[PDB]
Amino acid sequence: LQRFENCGIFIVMLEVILKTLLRSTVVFIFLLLAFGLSFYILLNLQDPFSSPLLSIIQTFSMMLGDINYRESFLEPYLRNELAHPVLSFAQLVSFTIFVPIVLMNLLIGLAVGDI
Amino acid sequence: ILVVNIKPGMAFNSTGIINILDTTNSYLIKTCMILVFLSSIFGYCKEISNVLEWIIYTTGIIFVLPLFVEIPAHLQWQCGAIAVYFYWMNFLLYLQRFENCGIFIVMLEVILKTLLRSTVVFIFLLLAFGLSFYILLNLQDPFSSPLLSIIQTFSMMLGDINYRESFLEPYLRNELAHPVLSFAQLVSFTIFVPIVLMNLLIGLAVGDIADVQKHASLKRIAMQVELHTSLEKKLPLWFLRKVDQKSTIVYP
Amino acid sequence: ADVQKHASLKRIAMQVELHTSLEKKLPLWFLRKVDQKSTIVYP
Ligand SMILES: C[C@H]1[C@H](F)C[C@@H](C(=O)NCc2cc(-c3cnc(C(F)(F)F)nc3)ncc2C(F)(F)F)N1S(=O)(=O)c1ccc(F)cc1
Numbered sequence: 001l002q003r004f005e006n007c008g009i010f011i012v013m014l015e016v017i018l019k020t021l022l023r024s025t026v027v028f029i030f031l032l033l034a035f036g037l038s039f040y041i042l043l044n045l046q047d048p049f050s051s052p053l054l055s056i057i058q059t060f061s062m063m064l065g066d067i068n069y070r071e072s073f074l075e076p077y078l079r080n081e082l083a084h085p086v087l088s089f090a091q092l093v094s095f096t097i098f099v100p101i102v103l104m105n106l107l108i109g110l111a112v113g114d115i
Numbered sequence: 116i117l118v119v120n121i122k123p124g125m126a127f128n129s130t131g132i133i134n135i136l137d138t139t140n141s142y143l144i145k146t147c148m149i150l151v152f153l154s155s156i157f158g159y160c161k162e163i164s165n166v167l168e169w170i171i172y173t174t175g176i177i178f179v180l181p182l183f184v185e186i187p188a189h190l191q192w193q194c195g196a197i198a199v200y201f202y203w204m205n206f207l208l209y210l211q212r213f214e215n216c217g218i219f220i221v222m223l224e225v226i227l228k229t230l231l232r233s234t235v236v237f238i239f240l241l242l243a244f245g246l247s248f249y250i251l252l253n254l255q256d257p258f259s260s261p262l263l264s265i266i267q268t269f270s271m272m273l274g275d276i277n278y279r280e281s282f283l284e285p286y287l288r289n290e291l292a293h294p295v296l297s298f299a300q301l302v303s304f305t306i307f308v309p310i311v312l313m314n315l316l317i318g319l320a321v322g323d324i325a326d327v328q329k330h331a332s333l334k335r336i337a338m339q340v341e342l343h344t345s346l347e348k349k350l351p352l353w354f355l356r357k358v359d360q361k362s363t364i365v366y367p
Numbered sequence: 368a369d370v371q372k373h374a375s376l377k378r379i380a381m382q383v384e385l386h387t388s389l390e391k392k393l394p395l396w397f398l399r400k401v402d403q404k405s406t407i408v409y410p
């Protein structure tokens with residue numbers, strides 16, 4: 001579709017943002033790996049974090065701002081199923097600040113700036 | 116390597132993993148513990164970057180103290196969850212030396228400081244909802260205590276309000292004590308904080324990252340020049356004369 | 368991004384409008400007691 005004037009500029013805008021997002025992972029995958037390996041320690045008794053790979057896929061999927069908060073922090077806390085409660089909520093807010101808010105606004109800053 | 120080969124919560128020693136004691140990774144666990152311990156005692160001697168290095172080395176020791184001193188399994192992994200996190204968070208602050216990484220850490224430093232100036236104001240906009248939902252929704256598990264109420268009303272700000280599970284399903288069972296005011300506070304939240312504050316933060320984020328990109332093509336080179344001159348101020352002069360070079364050829 | 372055009376002036380305009388509103392309403396002898404003509408700084 002790049003060969004039609006009606007289409008090609010939206011694929012220039014896709015090429016430009018996808019390449020920008022790619023340069024950004026060479027830094028921020030080491031941010032994801034901090035949360036993925038940390039929630040593997042803190043939430044290990046739960047199905048959705050049971051293994052380091054599933055924990056990094058979960059913290060990848062939480063990125064968009066859908067943390068499943070009641071289902072894996074609160075309902076476990078009110079049943080003592082959290083092993084490290086004071087630190088587990090401190091890692092919840094550290095994720096919520098750094099990723100759904102800081103990184104996902106940093107990427108709107110890049111995308112709006114480039115497009 | 117010491118994390119992913121041991122189930123989190125099990126005590127361990129150089130001899131292996133305790134449940135029973137078993138030896139199936141013992142040479143890997145022994146060598147990784149000695150390497151982390153050495154890295155931490157040398158880490159103190161090389162002593163926000165300066166603060167994170169204390170949090171890492173004072174805690175990565177506690178995760179590995181069972182190389183010498185037996186410790187509660189809970190304290191070993193509660194330290195592991197902190198040390199394993201801050202090792203990777205602080206790895207980004209080493210990436211600033213690479214030409215093509217550092218500008219994204221500059222854009223992270225700028226937006227994080229911009230959000231923190233905005234937090235000194237809007238914590239009181241959170242605490243208004245956090246203590247109001249503590250009154251209006253007290254019969255529900257997520258709002259059972261003022262601290263849990265403020266954690267829940269923090270976590271709602273992304274625009275994930277659990278509306279059916281805490282307003283409408285409770286309303287259709289008369290479990291809301293103050294129904295008219297409870298829905299009036301549900302709208303007042305949905306306006307002020309997943310819409311007005313998050314669109315304000317996107318306004319700050321775009322406005323100041325599009326200003327880093329105004330200088331980025333110079334900031335790359337200014338970081339490199341300040342790095343290489345800092346090393347010329349710290350390398351001994353004979354080494355610079357042996358290693359530096361007056362002319363170079365290129366073959367395109 | 369338009370408030371951030373004026374922000375570095377708007378900080379000061381808010382401070383000037385605050386301090387001049389108080390300077391109109393504190394009683395005249397109080398300003399003459401308090402409003403010192405020079406100040407030193409030690410960097
Ligand atoms: C660069 C940042 C942004 F801020 C947001 C996010 C992103 O959308 N990046 C695109 C991307 C992802 C992956 C990928 C593949 N597979 C996994 C695994 F292992 F989990 F399965 N993870 C990531 N590969 C290539 C790309 C690229 F081509 F687009 F560049 N990333 S982040 O670093 O992943 C990330 C950061 C924080 C966080 F909390 C969670 C994740």
Ligand SMILES: C[C@H]1[C@H](F)C[C@@H](C(=O)NCc2cc(-c3cnc(C(F)(F)F)nc3)ncc2C(F)(F)F)N1S(=O)(=O)c1ccc(F)cc1
Pocket residue numbers: 093096097101230231232233234235237238239240241244265266268269272308309312313316
């Ligand atoms: C400044 C505003 C933004 F618009 C959005 C949001 C945010 O992401 N700020 C980052 C942040 C949060 C916390 C924090 C820690 N711990 C709790 C507690 F008590 F709940 F556990 N709450 C907050 N600390 C430091 C930072 C900072 F360093 F980044 F600045 N905040 S807000 O004020 O919190 C907030 C506002 C409205 C709302 F409806 C809910 C919350």
